[PDB]
């Protein structure tokens, strides 16, 4: 039945290209998906939708100044492989925060009925923490699986450890676990091992090493996924291996976060 | 006894210069104050402290990697007129959010005992919303008074209305009210009237019109308040009138926020 997954990690490492390309690889093997963009910089769906940008719930709300007065097809549009896309996030142009804009958006979706029967997966592309307004895409009637995108960079890994402290310190004993660490490459054979090393430190797995290949940037300036743009590329089979691993994955763990002294040790040992 | 006030409003309108200059005008008439910077861009105390920047609780924490292992005089320093200064805010350099960094900071302060007997005023320089982690400086054992700094600018006023919706929708019936609207000038005699017009719409008062005068920028590049730098300036008596009005103010109201249709009407009518 409908698994609910959520992709956390920091910005600037390509987390949203990985999310779309995995979602496209899932669409392609028969799965029915919805992407829900819980990102202030709302951009998690342009590669599935071939969009300049997708209009958000928190921008079609203040626009029409609502309480309970917007529709589903005004915000949930379909794209590659029949994947359904929602944006939320940003107050932009208005003021405030975007974390609350996630709650006044997936609530719209629940009450609007977008979580229908044959949906296999719902993906939440959220951010740097598992707290309050950005932990909402992970509570009781929500995400039971969390995958962290990181890389062999100090800040990226420190965000992967801090997102993990938020998964253990979640508002009492519901079920939201850690599925794995997806790694978005930057260098050769001792970066995958560093993320495997952090994975084993926190009690998870590096569920896939996404290589750095040029087909990816060539697909995203042309507004597509590598699965759509070049289905025959080697990288295209990276997102299929990631997808099959996500589908079939059973290790959902409660992570054991490390000290920034321990993480200093790991980064000293690598670079 | 110790009144707890909190200054909200948007960024870029000079809210933090007004806060320091009012706090200095209060120091000067005998009052004992503490400024507590609950701002991500932690800069609410450089004019009282004559500081390049003040080291934050959420920067002396990760630095010394703490749980319960930092001291008070490592973060609370005194400045003009004996005003006591604290910074908190930012994760900077680390990742995450700064809203939670306000809770893991005034909690430090309570447990550390900075709210001593002869403190007349505690001021919280916070931001754009009265929600969760930035509403914490306003709950039960905290701020009972809220002053919003704004101006005759679309976004500034829209933030003053939205901070007001957060004061009415606060987590049940404790006491945190709206003290008034401080206006930081930009133009002549129909801007003070516009903020008076919004004040009366929400059921408060424009408690003071802070004029635009050059002595202010000349005092802040020299890292002081106008009360310290030129006590004899006309603007120096603006912050004294504001200060006496804050001391003596009794209208603490539960605001009645307007629609963005009503605020469109007010801005059409002015500019
Ligand atoms: S808080 S409007 Fe950790 Fe968002
Ligand atoms: S939420 S770590 Fe309206 Fe902050």
Ligand lying nearest the CA atom of residue B95: 2
Cα separation, B88 vs A206, whole angstroms: 35
Breaks after residues in chain A, judged by C–N over 2.5 Å: none
The gap from C-alpha B184 to its chain's centroid, in whole angstroms, comes to 13
CATH number belonging to domain A1-271: 3.40.50.300
Give resolution in angstroms: 2.5
Q: Which residue in A has a C-alpha nearest to residue B63's C-alpha?
A: A260
In short, whether A165's Cβ falls inside 6 Å of ligand 2 is no
Burial A216-231 (b: 16+ CB within 10 A, else e): beebbeeebbbbbbbe
Compute CA distances A126 → A98, A137, A147, A148, A244, whole Å: 11, 8, 11, 10, 22
- Residue A182: other Cβ atoms inside 10 A: 25
The residues near A253 (Cβ < 8 Å, ≥ 6 apart) are: A177, A178, A202, A203, A204
Q: Which residues of B touch A260 (CB under 8 A)?
A: 62, 65
CA end-to-end span of chain A, whole Å? Answer: 42
Q: In chain B, count H helices and then E strands.
A: 9, 8
**In chain A, what is the greatest distance between 2 CA atoms, to the nearest angstrom?**
56
Query: Where are chain B's structural domains?
Result: 1-271
The residues near A23 (Cβ < 8 Å, ≥ 6 apart) are: A33, A35, A48, A83, A121, A123, A225
Q: In this structure, are residues B206 and B196 in contact, taking their beta carbons and an 8 Å threshold?
A: yes
When CB atoms are compared, the residue of B95, B132, B159 closest to A95 is B159
Hey, is A34 helix, strand or coil? strand
**Record: contact B132-A129, CB cut-off 8 A:** no
Contact with chain B for residue A201, Cβ under 8 A: no
Environment class of A1 (CB within 10 Å of its CB; exposed 0-12, middle 13-18, buried 19+): exposed
Residue closest by Cα to atom 4 of ligand 1: A99
Candidates B109, B113, B108, B168; CA nearest to B135 is: B168
Hey, is B218 helix, strand or coil? helix
**What does R_g of chain A's alpha carbons equal in angstroms?**
18
Burial B112-149 (b: 16+ CB within 10 A, else e): eebeeeebebbbbbbbbbbbbbbbbbbeeebbbbbbbb
- State how far residue B62 is from chain A, nearest Cα, in angstroms: 9
When CB atoms are compared, the residue of B95, B129, B261 closest to A159 is B95
**Record: contact B95-A65, CB cut-off 8 A:** no
């Amino acid at each position: 039945a409908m698994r609910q997954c959520a992709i956390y990690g920091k910005g600037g490492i390509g987390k949203s290209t990985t999310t779309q390309n995995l979602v496209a690889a899932l669409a392609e093997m028969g799965k029915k998906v919805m992407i829900v963009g819980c990102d202030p910089k709302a951009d998690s769906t342009r590669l599935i939708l071939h969009s300049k940008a997708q209009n958000t719930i928190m921008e079609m709300a203040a626009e029409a100044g609502t309480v309970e007065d917007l529709e589903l097809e005004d915000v949930l549009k379909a794209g590659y492989g029949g994947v359904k896309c929602v944006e939320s996030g940003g107050p932009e142009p208005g003021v405030g925060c975007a974390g609350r804009g996630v709650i006044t958006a997936i609530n719209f979706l629940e009450e609007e009925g977008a979580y229908e029967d044959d949906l296999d997966f719902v993906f939440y592309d959220v951010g740097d923490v598992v707290c309050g307004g950005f932990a909402m895409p992970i509570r009781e009637n929500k995400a039971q699986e969390i995958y962290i995108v990181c890389s062999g960079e100090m800040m990226a890994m420190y965000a992967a450890n801090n997102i993990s402290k938020g998964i253990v310190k979640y508002a009492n004993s519901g079920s939201v676990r850690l599925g794995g660490l997806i790694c978005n490459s930057r260098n050769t054979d001792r970066e995958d091992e560093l993320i495997i090393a952090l994975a084993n430190k926190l009690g998870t797995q590096m569920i896939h090493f996404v290589p750095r290949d040029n087909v990816v940037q060539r697909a995203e300036i042309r507004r597509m996924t590598v699965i759509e743009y070049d289905p025959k590329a080697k990288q295209a089979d990276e997102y299929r291996a990631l997808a099959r691993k996500v589908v079939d994955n059973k290790l959902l763990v409660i992570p054991n976060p490390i000290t920034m002294d321990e993480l200093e040790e790991l980064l000293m040992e690598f670079g």
